[PDB]
Amino acid sequence: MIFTLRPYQQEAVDATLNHFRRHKTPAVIVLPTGAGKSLVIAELARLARGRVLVLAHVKELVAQNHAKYQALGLEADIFAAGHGKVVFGSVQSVARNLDAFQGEFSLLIVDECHRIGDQYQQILTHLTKVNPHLRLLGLTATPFRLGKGWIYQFHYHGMVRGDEKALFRDCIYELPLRYMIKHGYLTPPERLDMPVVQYDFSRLQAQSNGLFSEADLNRELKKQQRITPHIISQIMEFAATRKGVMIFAATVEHAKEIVGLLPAEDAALITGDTPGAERDVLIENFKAQRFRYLVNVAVLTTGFDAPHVDLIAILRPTESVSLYQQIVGRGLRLAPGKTDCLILDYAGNPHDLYAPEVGTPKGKSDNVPVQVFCPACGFANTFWGKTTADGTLIEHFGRRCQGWFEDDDGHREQCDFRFRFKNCPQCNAENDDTVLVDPDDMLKAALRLKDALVLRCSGMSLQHGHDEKGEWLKITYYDEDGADVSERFRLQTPAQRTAFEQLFIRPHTRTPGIPLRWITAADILAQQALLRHPDFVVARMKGQYWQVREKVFDY
């Protein structure tokens, strides 16, 4: 025709076609920010019946998307303040003019589809009303943002990222950032091997969601504000050998500090508090290099992502790779004679540009991604864990296999293998279909009763021995005030060592799914750092000595 697709662009067309030939449900394609997303929109539209509508929420992403589409030598329309086979509209402008969209429409593409949470469902109702079989494809460079969840639920590689509540049931294609860089479709990123002054944010604890707080951050900074223009110095140095420098501070009160730097008119701080009549006095100044330094709160973008950008200075710690790969990618575009984008990583971010995304909040700040094979389906999950020097698993915090599979009878389901269990994952209802009781409610019931003991567990000690019937292992749970409660396990018969693995190791192990190797009770004491202790123990006076009836783990 008029254009030629790259081998990865046909896969995204071919994947979107094979999906809509099978399923009527929406889908999403994950794409980098230098991928050439207009070429997929154009081929999909070349093969379409009726019309194709390319929505977007922010206006400049519409106008820019259209500029990128027509720049292919093709004809299309626009809907904003400003009838064709393809239309480029914005949610707000399209939602008041539904009278122009009454013909056949076979595809609706939603650019930056992660932003469907911030109207739009009025278009989805109208279109779906004229076109009952309208197909929905969304596009995005970030399908996951910490504190918001995921956009899709099922990934075509075989795992599960969200749940029934996700907007898009499926992600049918993903273009890795590693790939794009490997084959030159993207500028290569160089990290300054080591910087002499960075910050240290280990003395910080994320909130419940997983994101650090506006308060907690400017308090770790002030304690080191004596290290800041020693940093901007390094940043200042080679920021003369680059046409564009983007900086991401920890916040606004971190920008004002790091805004200067250079008394430029300007270095011109973008933030989430200006139009769009201001986004505009510096869009077109930065995209034209007026104005070289650009600092951000930030999220942020989704403009000012200009090809000429060739230096990324990380002035905030990244909680998830998705945000690090999101930042670093803002400046990986292709530009005439731009051999690389250098990344100056202050502030304690690892060199993990291709690390997998566990997609859950870390927890312990020293956690890292570890991979555990599912004993049922063999799917290799990525959980939060802690490894030693040689890459050996010490602990992992996954609870259920995240893989899924489908039968030739259409039925699709997630692997029901539980790494942490009562009789299913922590929840309200399985038989143990009775309403499950709550750990707090069970503690309260046993506190309110004598012949019962409820001790906060501070640790446990193991002892072993034997007699004419083989060995045994005695475990003793103790208080921070010396309160004891014990239980004993015989390890002699196969029905006895089997129960021991069933009743004591699977709940107490730190790497469930990975079995403990042992021959005698001695091999179990050797590895007692592989075992954790309950958080609460509940015991009933059944014999005149205390007997254990409940252990509470991960409270």
Ligand X SMILES: Nc1ncnc2c1ncn2[C@@H]1O[C@H](COP(=O)(O)OP(=O)(O)OP(O)(O)=S)[C@@H](O)[C@H]1O
Chain residues in the site for ligand X (CB under 6 A): 4-6, 9, 31, 33-39, 68, 334
Give, in order, the Cα–Cα distances in Å from 382 to each of 111, 160, 211, 317: 28, 11, 20, 22
Alpha helices in 377-429 (DSSP H): none
- Distance separating alpha carbons of residues 358 and 417, to the nearest angstrom: 18
- Residue 5 binds which one of Zn ion, ligand X, none, with CB within 5 to 8 A depending on kind? ligand X
**Least CB distance to ligand X at residue 63 (A):** 12
Nearer to Zn ion, 335 or 377 (CB): 377
Closest listed residue to residue 378, CA positions, set 411, 394, 402: 402
Nearer to ligand X, 39 or 505 (CB): 39
- Residue 518 binds which one of ligand X, Zn ion, none, with CB within 5 to 8 A depending on kind? none
SS3 for 219?
A: helix
- Residue 16 binds which one of Zn ion, ligand X, none, with CB within 5 to 8 A depending on kind? none
**Least CB distance to Zn ion at residue 477 (A):** 32
**Least CB distance to Zn ion at residue 402 (A):** 8
Determine the interface stretch with Zn ion among 338-346, 394-402, 505-513, 543-551 (rule: CB under 5 A). 394-402
- Distance separating alpha carbons of residues 371 and 461, to the nearest angstrom: 30
Nearer to ligand X, 126 or 308 (CB): 308
At 458, list the tokens.
């501070």
Nearer to Zn ion, 46 or 420 (CB): 420
Matching residue, tokens 């009781």:
437
**Least CB distance to ligand X at residue 319 (A):** 24
Instruction: Candidates 134, 401, 457, 475: give the one binding Zn ion (CB under 5 A).
Output: 401
159 near Zn ion, judged by CB under 5 A: no
Q: Is 341 annotated as a binding residue?
A: no
Q: How many secondary structure helices (H) and strands (E) does the chain include?
A: 15, 26
**Least CB distance to Zn ion at residue 374 (A):** 3
- Distance separating alpha carbons of residues 329 and 30, to the nearest angstrom: 14
Nearer to ligand X, 244 or 513 (CB): 244
Closest listed residue to residue 42, CA positions, set 94, 85, 106: 85
Q: What share of the chain is helix, strand, coil (3-state, %, to 5)?
A: 25, 25, 50
Nearer to Zn ion, 58 or 372 (CB): 372
Q: Say if strands 144-145 and 149-150 run parallel, antiparallel, or are unpaired.
A: antiparallel
CA atoms within 13 A on the CB side of 438: 3
At 275, list the tokens.
């139009």
Give, in order, the Cα–Cα distances in Å from 178 to each of 43, 331, 332, 352: 25, 15, 12, 11
**Least CB distance to ligand X at residue 323 (A):** 17
Site map 348..377 versus Zn ion, x via CB under 5 A: --------------------------x-xx
Q: Say if strands 27-30 and 168-174 run parallel, antiparallel, or are unpaired.
A: parallel
- Residue 36 binds which one of ligand X, Zn ion, none, with CB within 5 to 8 A depending on kind? ligand X
**Least CB distance to Zn ion at residue 401 (A):** 3
**Measured in whole angstroms, how far is the alpha carbon of residue 519 from the centre of its chain?**
41
**Least CB distance to ligand X at residue 336 (A):** 10
**Least CB distance to Zn ion at residue 405 (A):** 9
Instruction: Please give the size of the binding site for Zn ion, defined by CB under 5 A.
Output: 8
Footprint on residues 413-452 left by Zn ion (CB under 5 A): 415, 417
- Residue 418 binds which one of ligand X, Zn ion, none, with CB within 5 to 8 A depending on kind? none
Please report the DSSP string for 28-62 in residue order: EEE--TTS-THHHHHHHHHT-SBEEEEE-SSHHHH
Nearer to ligand X, 5 or 530 (CB): 5
- Residue 417 binds which one of ligand X, Zn ion, none, with CB within 5 to 8 A depending on kind? Zn ion
At 140, list the tokens.
């995005």
- Residue 35 binds which one of Zn ion, ligand X, none, with CB within 5 to 8 A depending on kind? ligand X
Nearer to ligand X, 123 or 175 (CB): 175
CA atoms within 13 A on the CB side of 548: 21
Q: Say if strands 484-490 and 459-467 run parallel, antiparallel, or are unpaired.
A: unpaired
Binding site as annotated, residues: 374, 377, 401, 415
Binding site as annotated, residues for Zn(2+): 374, 377, 401, 415
Binding site for Zn ion (CB under 5 A): 374, 376-377, 379, 401, 403, 415, 417
